[PDB]
Every structure is written in C-alpha cells, then in structure tokens.
Design a binder for this molecule. Structure first.
Ligand SMILES: Nc1nc2c(ncn2[C@@H]2O[C@H](COP(=O)(O)OP(=O)(O)O)[C@@H](O)[C@H]2O)c(=O)[nH]1
Ligand SMILES: [Mg+2]
Ligand code: NI
Length: 215
C-alpha cells in the first residue's frame, strides 16, 4: 500500500485544489500528446499537465508551445509513474499558479501497456488509448491495463481502413473484460471526436466521477 497510501494522500490534495484528475495510459506513440495538444483548443477545457517520460522534455515542450502549463517528470529508467513522483510536479504547478486556473490536472503516463496498470496515482479517471496501428487484438493481450480503464479511446481512427482494423474486436473484448467502460473513436483529423470526448470529461467532472479501481 506504499504507493496506495501515497496515492490516497495525493487525492486529498487534488480535491483540496478542486482538480479533476485524469491518468492517460497507452503504448508509446498511441497519440497521447497530440490529443492533449488538440484538447488545448477548447477554451472551456481548462487543464495543466504532468508528463511522464524516461528522458527529454519533448512532450512537455510540445504542450507548452501550445500554451498549456506542463511539467515533465523524468523517470530515468522507471517504466511507469508512481504517486510520489506526482508530488514534485504538483508542487511546482501549484506555485506557478497553474492549479488555480485549472479544472483538470492531466497525467500523461510513461508509454507502456503493462506496468502503469499497477500504480494508483489518485486519479478520478484512468483512460487507456489503443491506436489502430497497434492491432485490434491488444485488449486481451494486455487485460490488466484495459480492466483499469474508466474509458477506452480507439485513437488514430482515421487509419481503420488501411489497417483492416476491427472495432468490433475491441468492442467484444472490452465487453468480456469491462463492459461498463465506454469506448471512443478518436482521430486528430476529426475535431468532432475531440469535442465529444471533451464534453464527456466535462460531464464526468460535473458528476464528480471518482474511480474505485484497485491497482
Ligand atoms: N493518423 C493519425 N496519426 C496520429 C493521430 N494522433 C497522433 N498521430 C501521430 O502519431 C504519432 C505519435 O503521436 P504522439 O502524440 O507523439 O503519441 P504519444 O507518444 O502517445 O504521446 C505522431 O506522428 C502523430 O502525428 C491520429 O489521430 N491519426
Ligand atoms: Mg507523448
Ligand atoms: Ni515495466
């Protein structure tokens, strides 16, 4: 419970700051940073970002180039984020005034479809991206990751035809694993899909949905 304890303590601070916290998990390159870049275009969607990578400030810089307050966590070798890692980034974002102006604090986890599924970060929602080029068979291959999802995003949905990707396969696999979890088709080329997902998040904050998932 060491991480579990720390996650619970971070959740105290999230609520204190009036933040709805999202934890995005996927394979490397599923489209997380691009999605956040596109979400920044919705003025009614106010958020700051904690970025998890092994090295470089490449994702954080892309986001800051778009006007999003973002801070990079460099894990060095760790394949995942842990609750204790969030604290440092949280404190900086607080001191910078980023938290005061945000309705959402968004955690972009280390690219990894396995290990981040085992670490509670105190998030209200844990959302998993599965990109079309990865294959429509991945849900059952990484069941523990997809079972922690409060929502699944099929990203790069513009690529469905060229990859002969079967949305039905993902739907049916998720039906077995976690039927309550909604599935979203998303493309960076489809503003309407971004808008739909944004409104979904807004409503979730409204309800104050808080995942009870055990990691
Ligand atoms: N075709 C297509 N490409 C995308 C989409 N979203 C992201 N990409 C591309 O996928 C690559 C990796 O995206 P990135 O945002 O870095 O994903 P991340 O590593 O998970 O943060 C980049 O070349 C993006 O241009 C999409 O919806 N459709
Ligand atoms: Mg990224
Ligand atoms: Ni690992």
């Amino acid at each position: 419970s060491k991480n579990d304890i720390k996650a619970a303590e971070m959740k105290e601070r999230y609520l204190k700051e009036g933040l709805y916290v999202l934890n995005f998990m996927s394979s490397p390159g599923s489209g997380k940073t691009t999605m956040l870049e596109n979400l920044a275009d919705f003025k009614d969607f106010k958020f700051c970002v904690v970025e998890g990578d092994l090295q470089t400030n490449r994702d954080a810089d892309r986001l800051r180039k778009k006007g999003v307050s973002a801070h990079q966590i460099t894990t060095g070798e760790a394949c995942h984020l842990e609750a204790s890692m969030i604290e440092g980034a949280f404190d900086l974002l607080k001191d910078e005034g980023a938290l005061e102006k945000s309705d959402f604090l968004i955690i972009e986890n280390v690219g990894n479809l396995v290990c981040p599924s085992s670490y509670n970060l105190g998030a209200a929602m844990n959302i998993v991206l599965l990109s079309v080029p990865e294959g429509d068979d991945k849900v059952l291959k990484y069941p523990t990751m997809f079972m922690c999802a409060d929502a699944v995003i099929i990203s790069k949905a513009d690529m469905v035809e060229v990859f002969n990707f079967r949305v039905s396969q993902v739907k049916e696999d998720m039906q077995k694993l976690k039927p309550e979890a909604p599935i979203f088709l998303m493309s960076s080329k489809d503003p309407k899909s971004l808008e739909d997902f944004k409104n979904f998040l807004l409503e979730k904050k409204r309800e104050n949905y808080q995942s009870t998932h055990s990691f």
